[PDB]
C-alpha cells in the first residue's frame, strides 16, 4: 500500500528522468515508461510500436537471448512488457537487492538495442501467432471492430496491425521507430519502492553511463496534435458461424480527453453501468438475466471511446441492446441521477483503492500519469475531484456526449 503520496523526480545529466514514489515492503516495480503506441502510427507503419517492443526483448549487444534466459531462471529478474494504443512499458518487479542488475538489463535493452534484419524476421511468426490467438478472443475482436468503424484515424488501427501490415514491416521501420520514440525526452524511468530516491538515481546513473545527452529536442513524434483523432459513429455487422447460437455486440460513444472537466463524470457514468459478474449487476439494469456485460471508457489524445459490450444468444441479442440503452437513459432521469452519481463515484473509488497494494499497478499508473498529463495527479487530490463531482457535472457530460448522439455499433453473429 501507498499513502496518498507524491513522486520524487530527478533528471540525470544524460536527460533520463528518474521518478520514484515511496512504498512499504520488500517489493519494487521499476522500469521504462515510453510514449510509443499505435495512436502514433500511420497506414504505412501500423503495428511497428508493438513489433519493436518484441524485438527489444529479443536481446542486444551486452544481453543476448541466452543471457536473458539465465537471468529469468537463476537470478529472479522477470521482464514484462506491453504496448497499448497510447503507451509502451518494459519493467521488472523485484526483490530490493537485484536493483543494479535490473536497472542495467532494462536500460541496456530499451535504450541500447541491436536491431538486426535476423532478429526482426525470426520474430515475425511469433507476432502473427499472437495475432491469431487474440483473434479468437471475440471480446478483443469486437473491441477492435468498434475502434475501426469509429475512427478513420489511427485509433482505429489494431495495436498489432492488420495481417497485411504485420507482413510488410521492415527492419528500417523497426529501427526508425526506436530512433524517433525511444529517446530520453519521450520517456520516464519509474520506481515504486521503499529504497530512497537517491539509491535509484545512483543505480540508473550507473546503468545508463553509455548514453549520451540529446543535442536538440525535435518536436516529439508522440505529440497528440500530430495525431488528431476523429470519431464518427458507425454501424457494422459481421458473421462468425463457428460461434453457433451466439452473437457479440458492442456500443460506442466518443469520450472526453484525459484533461477534460468531463473526464471524471464520464468515468462515473461508465462505472455505474459497469460490469456483470457472477454475483453483481448494476441497479440500472432492468433485466438482470442478461448473459454478460462489460463497460470501458478510455481517453485517446483529443478524443476517447466509451464502450459497452457482451454476448447473448441470437434470440436475446436485440433485447441486450435495449437493456443497455435503457440503463444509460435511466442515469439522466431526475429520480435517479443522484443515486447514479453516488454509486458510480463509489465504484471509481473501489476500482482505484484495489490497485494500491500491487506495486506493478502503482508503477503503471505512475508511468501513464507522467507520460500523459500536463502535470502529475495524486490519489488524494483525485479523490477530492471525485467527491467534488456533482449532479450538474453528470448532466453536462450527458449533454456533450450522450444526448442526441448516434452510437457506433458492431454485431458479430452466428446467423
Amino acid at each position: 500500500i501507498s499513502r496518498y503520496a507524491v513522486p520524487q523526480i530527478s533528471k540525470l545529466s544524460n536527460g533520463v528522468r528518474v521518478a520514484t514514489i515511496p512504498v512499504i515492503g520488500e517489493a519494487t516495480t521499476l522500469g521504462y515508461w515510453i510514449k510509443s503506441g499505435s495512436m502514433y502510427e500511420n497506414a504505412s507503419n501500423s503495428g511497428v510500436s508493438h513489433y519493436l517492443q518484441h524485438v527489444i526483448f529479443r536481446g542486444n549487444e551486452k544481453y543476448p537471448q541466452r543471457k536473458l534466459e539465465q537471468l529469468a531462471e537463476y537470478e529472479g529478474i522477470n521482464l514484462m512488457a506491453s504496448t497499448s494504443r497510447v503507451t509502451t512499458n518494459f519493467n521488472a518487479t523485484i526483490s530490493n537487492d537485484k536493483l543494479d542488475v535490473a536497472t542495467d538489463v532494462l536500460s541496456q535493452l530499451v535504450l541500447n538495442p541491436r536491431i538486426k534484419k535476423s532478429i526482426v524476421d525470426n520474430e515475425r511468426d511469433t507476432i502473427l501467432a499472437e495475432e491469431y490467438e487474440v483473434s479468437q478472443d471475440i471480446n478483443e475482436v469486437i473491441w477492435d471492430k468498434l475502434h475501426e468503424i469509429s475512427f478513420k484515424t489511427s485509433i482505429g488501427f489494431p495495436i498489432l496491425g492488420s495481417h497485411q501490415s504485420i507482413q510488410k514491416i521492415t527492419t528500417e521501420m523497426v529501427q526508425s521507430q526506436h530512433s524517433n520514440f525511444f529517446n530520453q525526452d519521450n520517456l520516464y524511468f519509474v520506481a515504486v519502492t521503499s529504497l530512497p530516491h537517491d539509491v535509484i538515481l545512483k543505480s540508473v546513473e550507473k546503468a545508463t553511463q553509455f548514453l549520451k545527452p540529446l543535442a536538440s529536442h525535435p518536436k516529439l513524434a508522440s505529440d497528440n496534435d500530430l495525431h488528431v483523432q476523429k470519431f464518427e459513429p458507425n454501424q457494422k455487422q459481421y458473421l462468425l458461424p463457428q460461434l453457433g447460437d451466439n452473437a457479440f455486440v458492442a456500443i460506442g460513444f466518443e469520450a472526453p480527453s484525459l484533461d477534460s472537466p468531463l473526464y471524471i463524470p464520464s468515468q462515473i457514468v461508465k462505472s455505474v453501468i459497469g460490469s456483470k459478474e457472477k454475483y453483481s449487476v448494476s441497479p440500472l439494469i432492468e433485466n438482470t438475466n442478461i448473459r454478460t456485460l462489460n463497460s470501458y471508457s478510455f481517453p485517446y489524445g483529443n478524443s476517447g471511446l466509451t464502450a459497452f459490450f457482451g454476448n447473448e444468444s441470437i434470440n436475446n441479442l436485440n433485447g441486450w441492446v435495449n437493456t443497455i440503452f435503457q440503463s444509460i437513459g435511466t442515469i439522466f432521469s431526475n429520480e435517479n441521477i443522484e443515486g447514479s452519481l453516488n454509486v458510480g463515484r463509489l465504484c471509481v473509488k473501489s476500482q482505484l483503492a484495489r490497485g494500491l497494494s500491487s506495486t506493478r499497478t502503482i508503477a503503471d499508473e505512475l508511468g501513464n500519469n507522467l507520460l500523459l498529463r500536463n502535470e502529475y495527479m495524486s490519489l488524494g487530490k483525485w479523490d477530492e475531484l471525485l467527491n467534488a463531482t456533482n449532479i450538474n457535472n453528470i448532466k453536462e457530460y450527458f449533454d456533450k456526449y450522450i444526448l442526441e448522439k448516434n452510437a457506433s455499433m458492431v454485431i458479430i453473429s452466428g446467423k
Binding site: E73, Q136, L240, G274, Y279, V281, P283, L356, S357
Partner: protein, 397 residues
C-alpha cells in the same frame, strides 16, 4: 496470521498486512464429496450465497467482491469490500451461515448457470485437470463428484450441509475486521463439531470422461475443445508434511507450457506436434496429495505423449545442479484467498517468507526421495475424450 479461539469455541484466523481492502469469510470441511452427486454441493452453496447477498443489485451498490471455492473435501467463502460496506458484508455473511434452505426458484436459476458452466467460461482446463485426477486417483468413488454437472445428469439441493456449515466454520478476515468477526462468531453455536476426515487412499484407476466440449467458452472460440486431456496422477504428501517444499520443487522441475523452459515444455510440447500444452501440479488434500501431469494433445497422440513423460521421469534422476536450483527459482510469485486456503490445510502460505525459505532449505536429497516414492506407483490415468486409458497405462511397466 492472528489465531483466536472465541468464547464459544469458534476459531478465527486474521490476515496480517497493510489496510485498504477489507476481507471476511468462512472455511469449512464440506466439499463436493459430501453430497451424493457432481454439482450438488456447488449449486447448493451458490444458491445460499446469492440469497445471502439479497440481490446482485445489492452486491453492486456496495461494491462487494464475493468468491466461493468448493473443493472435494472442503469449501470457503470470501467477501471483499471497502470499509463503508462493512455492515452489508457482515450481515450477508451472517445470512450465509444461518442454516436456512434457499428458495427453489433460486436453486433452478443456479442450476441453469451450472449446466452452462463451460459455455460461460466457468469450467476451464484447470477445473478439468482436477476432475480427471479426482475421478481416477481415489479409492473412494465419491471423489468423482465435481462442481460442474454433465448435460445429462441431475442436480439436487442438499439442505443438511447448510445446517452443517455454522457447526464447523472457522472464520477468516483481514486484521482490521477483528471486532466485527468476533461479534459474528459469537452469534454462532458453541461449540464446533470435530469429525475425523482423512483423504481417501491412492488407486491407479483407468477412466474416461468422454464428453463433448463447447466450441465457445467464455468469450473465446477455444483452441483446445477438439483436443483431448490426459491426466496422469501419483500420490504425494499432505499439505503439512515436511516433504511439501521438495514436491513443489519437483513439480517445477517438470514445469510445462503452451505456445499460443522446463522438462514438459521442451520434451513433451516440443516432442508432440498438435499438443497445445502440458503442465505438472502438486495438488493437496485434507491429509494427502496428488502429483499430476496433464497433457492437452490430439487423442491419437496421448500414448506417444505418455512415453515422453516416462522419459521425463527418468531424466529427473540425472538432473543438473543448475535446474535443481532454477526450479527453486520458479517457486516465486487473491492474496487473501491463499491465506484462507493455506489456513485450512495448516501449511505456510505461498506468499510468506517462511515458505520461500523452505524452498531453498531442501536439496537433491529430499527431491530424489520424493521422486523415488512417488513414481514407484502405477499412475492413475484419466482421459477427457475417447482414448483407451489402459493403452496409456501400459507405457509405465
Amino acid at each position: 496470521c492472528v489465531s483466536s479461539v472465541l468464547p464459544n469455541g469458534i476459531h478465527l484466523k486474521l490476515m496480517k498486512g497493510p489496510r485498504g481492502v477489507c476481507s471476511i469469510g468462512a472455511v469449512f470441511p464440506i466439499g463436493s464429496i459430501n453430497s451424493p452427486k457432481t454439482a450438488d454441493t456447488q449449486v447448493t452453496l451458490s444458491s445460499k450465497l446469492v440469497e445471502s447477498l439479497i440481490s446482485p443489485k445489492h452486491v453492486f451498490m456496495h461494491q462487494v467482491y464475493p468468491f466461493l471455492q468448493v473443493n472435494r473435501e472442503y469449501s470457503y467463502l470470501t467477501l471483499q469490500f471497502l470499509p463503508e460496506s462493512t455492515t452489508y458484508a457482515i450481515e450477508s455473511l451472517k445470512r450465509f451461515l444461518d442454516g436456512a434452505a434457499p428458495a427453489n426458484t433460486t436453486f433452478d436459476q443456479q442450476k441453469q448457470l451450472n449446466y452452462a458452466a463451460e459455455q460461460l467460461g466457468e469450467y476451464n482446463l484447470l477445473e478439468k485437470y482436477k476432475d480427471l485426477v479426482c475421478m481416477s486417483s481415489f479409492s473412494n468413488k465419491s471423489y468423482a463428484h465435481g462442481n460442474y454437472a454433465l448435460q445429462g445428469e441431475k442436480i439436487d439441493l442438499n439442505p443438511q450441509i447448510l445446517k452443517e456449515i455454522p457447526k464447523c466454520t472457522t472464520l477468516v478476515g483481514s486484521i482490521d475486521m477483528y471486532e466485527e468477526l468476533v461479534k459474528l462468531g459469537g452469534s454462532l453455536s458453541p461449540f464446533p463439531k470435530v469429525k475425523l476426515h482423512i483423504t481417501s487412499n491412492f488407486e491407479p484407476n483407468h477412466v474416461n470422461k468422454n464428453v463433448k466440449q463447447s466450441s465457445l467458452q467464455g468469450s473465446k472460440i477455444s483452441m483446445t475443445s477438439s483436443l483431448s486431456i490426459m491426466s496422469l496422477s501419483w500420490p504425494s504428501c499432505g499439505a503439512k508434511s515436511v516433504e511439501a517444499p521438495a514436491y513443489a520443487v519437483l513439480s517445477k522441475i517438470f514445469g510445462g507450457g503452451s505456445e499460443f523452459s522446463s522438462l514438459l515444455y521442451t520434451k513433451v510440447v516440443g516432442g508432440v506436434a498438435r499438443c497445445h500444452q502440458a503442465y505438472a501440479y502438486n495438488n493437496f488434500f485434507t491429509t494427502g496429495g496428488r502429483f499430476n501431469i496433464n497433457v492437452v494433445a490430439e487423442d491419437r497422440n496421448l500414448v506417444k505423449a505418455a512415453q515422453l513423460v516416462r522419459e521425463c521421469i527418468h531424466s529427473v534422476e540425472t538432473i543438473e545442479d543448475k535446474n535443481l536450483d532454477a526450479a527453486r527459482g520458479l517457486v516465486i510469485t487473491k492474496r487473501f484467498n491463499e491465506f484462507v486456503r493455506s489456513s485450512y490445510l495448516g501449511c505456510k502460505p505461498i506468499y510468506s517468507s517462511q515458505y520461500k525459505k523452505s524452498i531453498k532449505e531442501v536439496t537433491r536429497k529430499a527431491v530424489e526421495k520424493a521422486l523415488k516414492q512417488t513414481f514407484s506407483y502405477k499412475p492413475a490415468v484419466a482421459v477427457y475424450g475417447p482414448a483407451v486409458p489402459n493403452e496409456i497405462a501400459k507405457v509405465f511397466e
